[PDB]
Amino acid sequence: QEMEGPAAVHYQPASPPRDACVYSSCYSEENVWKLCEYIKNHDQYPLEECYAVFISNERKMIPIWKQQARPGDGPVIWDYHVVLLHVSSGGQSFIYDLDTVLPFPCLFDTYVEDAIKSDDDIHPQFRRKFRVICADSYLKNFASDRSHMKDSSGNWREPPPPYPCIETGDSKMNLNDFISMDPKVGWGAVYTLSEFTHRFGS
Structure with missing residues (x-):
């Protein structure tokens, strides 16, 4: 036997169940944005x-x-x-x-x-x-x-989410600045896998 060294065994999800969330395949950046909203x-x-x-x-x-x-x-x-x-x-x-x-x-x-x-x-x-x-x-x-997400002829490679594009007052397109793992670009912090697990793992 081994006991763990607060547990959140009664953790209440921050979102509705999976099948009740807004979701489009191959747009996970927007699916997550919608969870944040x-x-x-x-x-x-x-x-x-x-x-x-x-x-x-x-x-x-x-x-x-x-x-x-x-x-x-x-x-x-x-x-x-x-x-x-x-x-x-x-x-x-x-x-x-x-x-x-x-x-x-x-x-x-x-x-x-x-x-x-x-x-x-x-x-x-x-x-x-x-x-x-x-x-x-x-x-x-x-x-x-x-x-x-458009092919060489301008048509959708995967069907888009059924609502208007996410934009801000400053930009209509900066997705590459989030995909990038250059810490000199974009917002937030960049971690290797071991840094990521060290930071948030139990």
């Missing part, structure tokens, strides 16, 4: 406890396991993927990934163990980096005109 307006949790987390790397090829786009034990290779992180007040973190087959939400350590896995034996050009943006900053600064 829900949390802002629901007055249950301080928005500052929440973060948008972009996952990508220099070559824009990151494996993520336990993804609904590929059922089974293999990974999806994304150019980037976005999830929501809630650091609950007691210290336990939860990941909200509308594309995972893991629970929604999922304990942070379980998400890292099963969906991310170790980079130790991964070919180095697939290794994962994480850009962590305060949810308040994400709502204030993110903008996407969806121009990255």
Whole structure:
């Protein structure tokens, strides 16, 4: 036997269940934005406890396991993927990934163990980096005109979300500044996988 060294065993989700959330496949940056907006307006949790987390790397090829786009034990290779992180007040973190087959939400350590896995034996050009943006900053600064989702003829590669493009007073398109893992670009903090787990893991 081993006991753990606050637990949040009665943690109340910051969002509705998965199937009740606004969602479009291949627009996880917007799916997470919409979760942030829900949390802002629901007055249950301080928005500052929440973060948008972009996952990508220099070559824009990151494996993520336990993804609904590929059922089974293999990974999806994304150019980037976005999830929501809630650091609950007691210290336990939860990941909200509308594309995972893991629970929604999922304990942070379980998400890292099963969906991310170790980079130790991964070919180095697939290794994962994480850009962590305060949810308040994400709502204030993110903008996407969806121009990255069109084919060479200007038609949609994947059907867009059924509402107007997210824009701010300052920008109509800065998605590349969130996908980038250059800490001199954009908002938030950039972590390697081990830095990310060191910072938020139990």
